[PDB]
Amino acid sequence: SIEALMLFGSAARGESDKSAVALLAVTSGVPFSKKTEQTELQFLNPEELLRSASDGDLFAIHLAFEGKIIFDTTGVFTRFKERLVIRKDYGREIKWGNDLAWYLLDFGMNAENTTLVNKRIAWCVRTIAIARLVESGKIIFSPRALAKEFPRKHVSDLIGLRSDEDSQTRKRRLAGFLDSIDSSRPSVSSEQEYVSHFERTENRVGLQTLHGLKPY
Amino acid sequence: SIEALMLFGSAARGESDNSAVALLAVTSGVRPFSKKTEQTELQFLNPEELLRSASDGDLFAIHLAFEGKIIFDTTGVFTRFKERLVIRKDYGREIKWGNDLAWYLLDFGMNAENTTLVNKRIAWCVRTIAIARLVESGKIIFSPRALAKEFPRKHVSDLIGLRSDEDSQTRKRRLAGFLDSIDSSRPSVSSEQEYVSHFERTENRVGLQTLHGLKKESPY
Amino acid sequence: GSIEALMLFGSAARGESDNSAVALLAVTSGVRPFSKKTEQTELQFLNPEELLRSASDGDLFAIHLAFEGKIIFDTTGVFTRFKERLVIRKDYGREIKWGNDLAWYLLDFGMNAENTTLVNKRIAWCVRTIAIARLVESGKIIFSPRALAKEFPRKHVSDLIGLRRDEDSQTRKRRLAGFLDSIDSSRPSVSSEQEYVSHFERTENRVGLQTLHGLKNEESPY
Amino acid sequence: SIEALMLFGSAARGESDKSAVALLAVTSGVRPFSKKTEQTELQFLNPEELLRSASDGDLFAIHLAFEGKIIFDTTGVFTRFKERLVIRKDYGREIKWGNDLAWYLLDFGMNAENTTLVNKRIAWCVRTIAIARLVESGKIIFSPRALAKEFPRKHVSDLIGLRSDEDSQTRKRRLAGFLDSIDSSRPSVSSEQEYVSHFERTENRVGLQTLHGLKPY
Numbered sequence A: 001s002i003e004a005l006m007l008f009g010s011a012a013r014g015e016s017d018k019s020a021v022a023l024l025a026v027t028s029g030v031p032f033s034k035k036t037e038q039t040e041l042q043f044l045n046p047e048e049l050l051r052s053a054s055d056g057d058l059f060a061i062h063l064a065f066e067g068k069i070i071f072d073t074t075g076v077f078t079r080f081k082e083r084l085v086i087r088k089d090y091g092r093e094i095k096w097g098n099d100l101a102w103y104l105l106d107f108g109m110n111a112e113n114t115t116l117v118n119k120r121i122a123w124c125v126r127t128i129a130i131a132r133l134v135e136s137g138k139i140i141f142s143p144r145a146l147a148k149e150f151p152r153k154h155v156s157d158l159i160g161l162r163s164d165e166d167s168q169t170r171k172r173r174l175a176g177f178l179d180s181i182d183s184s185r186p187s188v189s190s191e192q193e194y195v196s197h198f199e200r201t202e203n204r205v206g207l208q209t210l211h212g213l214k215p216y
Numbered sequence B: 001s002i003e004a005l006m007l008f009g010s011a012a013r014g015e016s017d018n019s020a021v022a023l024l025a026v027t028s029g030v031r032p033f034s035k036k037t038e039q040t041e042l043q044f045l046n047p048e049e050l051l052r053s054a055s056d057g058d059l060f061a062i063h064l065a066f067e068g069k070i071i072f073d074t075t076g077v078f079t080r081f082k083e084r085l086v087i088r089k090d091y092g093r094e095i096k097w098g099n100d101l102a103w104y105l106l107d108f109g110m111n112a113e114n115t116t117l118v119n120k121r122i123a124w125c126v127r128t129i130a131i132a133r134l135v136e137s138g139k140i141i142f143s144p145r146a147l148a149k150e151f152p153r154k155h156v157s158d159l160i161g162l163r164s165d166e167d168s169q170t171r172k173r174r175l176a177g178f179l180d181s182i183d184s185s186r187p188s189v190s191s192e193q194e195y196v197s198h199f200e201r202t203e204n205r206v207g208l209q210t211l212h213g214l215k216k217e218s219p220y
Numbered sequence C: 001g002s003i004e005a006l007m008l009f010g011s012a013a014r015g016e017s018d019n020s021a022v023a024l025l026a027v028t029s030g031v032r033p034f035s036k037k038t039e040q041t042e043l044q045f046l047n048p049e050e051l052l053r054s055a056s057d058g059d060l061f062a063i064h065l066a067f068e069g070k071i072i073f074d075t076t077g078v079f080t081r082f083k084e085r086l087v088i089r090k091d092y093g094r095e096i097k098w099g100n101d102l103a104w105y106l107l108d109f110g111m112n113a114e115n116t117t118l119v120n121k122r123i124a125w126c127v128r129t130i131a132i133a134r135l136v137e138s139g140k141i142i143f144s145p146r147a148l149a150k151e152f153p154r155k156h157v158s159d160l161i162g163l164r165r166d167e168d169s170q171t172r173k174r175r176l177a178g179f180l181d182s183i184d185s186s187r188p189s190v191s192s193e194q195e196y197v198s199h200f201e202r203t204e205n206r207v208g209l210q211t212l213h214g215l216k217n218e219e220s221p222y
Numbered sequence D: 001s002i003e004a005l006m007l008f009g010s011a012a013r014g015e016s017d018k019s020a021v022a023l024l025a026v027t028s029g030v031r032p033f034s035k036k037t038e039q040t041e042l043q044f045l046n047p048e049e050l051l052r053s054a055s056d057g058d059l060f061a062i063h064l065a066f067e068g069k070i071i072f073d074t075t076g077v078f079t080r081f082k083e084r085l086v087i088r089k090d091y092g093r094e095i096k097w098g099n100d101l102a103w104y105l106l107d108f109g110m111n112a113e114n115t116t117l118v119n120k121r122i123a124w125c126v127r128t129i130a131i132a133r134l135v136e137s138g139k140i141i142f143s144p145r146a147l148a149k150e151f152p153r154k155h156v157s158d159l160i161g162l163r164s165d166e167d168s169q170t171r172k173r174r175l176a177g178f179l180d181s182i183d184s185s186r187p188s189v190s191s192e193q194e195y196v197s198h199f200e201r202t203e204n205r206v207g208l209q210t211l212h213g214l215k216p217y
Helices: A046-054 A058-066 A076-083 A091-107 A114-135 A143-149 A167-180 A191-200 A204-212 B047-055 B059-067 B077-084 B092-109 B115-136 B144-150 B168-181 B192-201 B205-211 C048-056 C060-068 C078-085 C093-110 C116-137 C145-151 C169-182 C193-202 C206-214 D047-055 D059-067 D077-084 D092-109 D115-136 D144-150 D168-181 D192-201 D205-214
Strands: A002-008 A021-027 A033-035 A039-044 A068-072 B002-008 B021-027 B033-036 B040-045 B069-073 C003-009 C022-028 C034-037 C041-046 C070-074 D002-008 D021-027 D033-036 D040-045 D069-073
Touching (some): A039 C041, A046 A076, A058 A076, A058 A114, A058 B059, A068 C070, A091 A191, A114 A143, A114 A167, A191 A204, B002 B059, B002 B077, B021 D021, B040 B047, B040 D040, B047 B059, B047 B077, B059 B077, B059 B115, B069 D069, B092 B168, B092 B192, B092 B205, B115 B144, C003 C078, C048 C078, C060 C078, C070 C078, C093 C116, C093 C206, C116 C206, D002 D077, D047 D059, D047 D077, D059 D077, D069 D077, D092 D115, D092 D168, D115 D144, D115 D168, D115 D205
Parallel strands (some): A021 A039
Antiparallel strands (some): A002 A021, A033 A039, B002 B069, C003 C022, C003 C070, C034 C041, D002 D021, D002 D069, D033 D040
């Protein structure tokens, strides 16, 4: 009862660096994912997949724009694309990525799990860049393209294109990026105030990341 | 030579209905042309023209990006094409072209001898308006079946060829009801000659071609 | 090592739905052959040397990959080198004897095992293997169980490959013996269970050894 | 109505050079025909003829089954096609067709004005012989690059287009060297009209089309 299968992410674009071969299996009933060192198999049911198109999620836009359908026995990917509404305002997603970037600058740069911190920083930077580009009417997901289409300080370094520095250097790059996009910290200081801010603004990835410390 | 090849149109969506199998060959240097049989359309573009259609945000380029099935691409030209796409907020230029031609056909085309071309061009006008309005609202709809559902205006289904042999009286009132249901206004013209010069001033190529086709743009 | 190439195979590559699992072959340098499964997906890994070796050996799995696999991507050309290495043999007697010999062990010691679904699965593997190998010897490229039953219409093949049902242990053993009779099969010169083990070892019947020890690097359906 | 579509030939192998982009369209009721531009070939067959080529074990059907990329298939006809394939043990008929046409081209065709067509037909003869011999040995090779390695007879890589603006006597010496190296024998013919009747009696369809046009996958 896997009714449809799609290649997405870097392999869909024909990229090979970094990345991770990503496949989306559409199956009724059951949203988990099983991954190895270089593979990732995501499962979604049709209601969830269509909901992400209805909501205009950046991930849905990527699937519609770059996903390669391997098979589809039910037409669920046709219905997915017919439900897609690309929004004109991604300010909510942009603010989520801005706010989490400040959290990581303020509290994450000496964390034990450096790999997770670097990956979430990359997510913040990609999210801001993709969403800003969607607002201007362009559909860019490739990290190489993002650095050229969203020219801001250290974008290439931060989304992993250029990655084994020390804490001071990583923090300065992230601060230079945030200054370059004229970003300002939310009205918080402590980690606990970041938690409350993430809750009020319903920043799910911020909350997942903050507690986790305790790409396509 | 042929750098890349893409299935587009109805066969790219798995539709076999009026089912023209359409393939886009990207070939360096060559002018844009097409070789077509009863059931196939093989269209040739060079990379510069393909990328320009993306830069321009052409409806056809949006279709290729969101529905085209890449068969092969030896140069990455379809990646560069998608990175050049700029979807506009305002498709009023295309909408007015289809609107303006629709009024021409209403006024002068419904008694024309070439009934087939008239009905084909009416369907182009309606599909163009429907697709453009849906793109303005953030959607990626191109299937004629979906256009009728997603752009639920008067007589859309009949006017884009979803059955097909109605007389001249009936076809004219359907077109009139559609234009009314989208709050369309006839351009400031009356005679056929005034349409010609209006079509020329507004650079309505399809309008001029159609008008100068009824005397003496295929769906994707 | 990185994933050079990815191929859809098995029932999903044939457009056949069910139960069946979606099977995918990932080619990656360095790693030993291993699989990663869910209820409905099977992800197999091979390095290029092992993939090319199966082509050079004319393995039935390699023939299936070459004639039915759907390449999802291939950044190194490894699947072309694979196809250029395939040598389809005239004689699959060795594969046929493997399926024959495991069938006789199952007939003799497996029909009352508690793990009945594994026994039925391995019976189906024996029949499919014999059918596929005989058809390849005659120049055909058949792997779909539906088509196997029509192209290799020996006794009870449809039922023994799972194209129906479940019934009692008696009828199952009767069906299996009748299929072995219809292909003029003779039991190998063994009697006890350890004699089957030694015979599987001498003949290098990897699936026979895996099955026998499994009833008290596995074969994957395609 | 086109019920299925398949990419074949060099493009299906991800091979470029110049070799056209080739697509096979399956549509019912029509007789076989093709539409060609300089760089595309669009071949039309009905299901019955496609299935028949598989039952006959034609080299073209082997290539479609082994290397063709299905673009769409609304009826399952490519499945029934592959179930009908019987790969033969003996490709002597096809080998003799390629040998015989090679002798015609050597003895009568090298002087045709349409040198481009002659070189293409020579390459067809050499590829057909090599492919058929390899299939007899259980190998499924269609790529010209690989045919030259796996069937290394005299001048093979030259003759299948991997080297070509050579004059007529040079190309002629190469073809003669190839035929001698595979111990080929001229048919017992001594004129164009005798070649026509020989091609007819041996049912050498490509031979007859070549001769008449003078006088891929």
